[PDB]
Amino acid sequence: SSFSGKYQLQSQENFEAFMKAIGLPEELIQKGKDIKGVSEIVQNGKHFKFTITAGSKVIQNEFTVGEECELETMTGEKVKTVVQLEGDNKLVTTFKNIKSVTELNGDIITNTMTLGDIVFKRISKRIGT
Numbered sequence: 001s002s003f004s005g006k007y008q009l010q011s012q013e014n015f016e017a018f019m020k021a022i023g024l025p026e027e028l029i030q031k032g033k034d035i036k037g038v039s040e041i042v043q044n045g046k047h048f049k050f051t052i053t054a055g056s057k058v059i060q061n062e063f064t065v066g067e068e069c070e071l072e073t074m075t076g077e078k079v080k081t082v083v084q085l086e087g088d089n090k091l092v093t094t095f096k097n098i099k100s101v102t103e104l105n106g107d108i109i110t111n112t113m114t115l116g117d118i119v120f121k122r123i124s125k126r127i128g129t
């Protein structure tokens with residue numbers, strides 16, 4: 001249950017450039033750019049459930065570490081891939097050429113998505129339970 005909990009985005013780098021690159025409609029870009037979104041994670045051993053909420057836009061996902069999963073991405077595209085643990089605090093995966101590192105240190109979750117030379121970084125803090 002190491003990863004479990006509720007977090008809000010504090011700050012992000014390269015939101016707009018990244019979203020344009022992956023094909024997010026310009027409308028949801030302009031609205032979603034200042035939203036401090038909420039991610040809820042439930043871990044049970046290798047099995048994870050996670051929800052990303054950005055006012056009205058709810059994305060529900062699930063994966064088991066080491067197994068095939070189908071991840072619903074920000075556009076609505078679902079891609080088959082695998083999520084692995086790196087070290088004690090990292091969830092690592094690749095989907096549609098985007099490299100994704102999810103790093104937890106105490107109460108701060110750091111997510112970095114890299115597509116070619118574009119690095120999309122989000123910092124989020126724990127907000128209760």
Ligand SMILES: CCCCCCCCCCCCCCCC(=O)O
Pocket residue numbers: 028029031032033035037052054055056057074111
């Ligand atoms: C009212 C609709 C909400 C606005 C549109 C949502 C646009 C996306 C906002 C950023 C969400 C974060 C996506 C990356 C999070 C992650 O997968 O780690």
Ligand SMILES: CCCCCCCCCCCCCCCC(=O)O
Pocket residue numbers: 038039041050052071072073074083091093100102109110111122123124
């Ligand atoms: C947008 C496509 C899904 C992103 C791939 C993430 C899969 C493993 C990580 C699960 C927990 C995500 C927590 C990140 C915190 C945040 O929202 O910034």
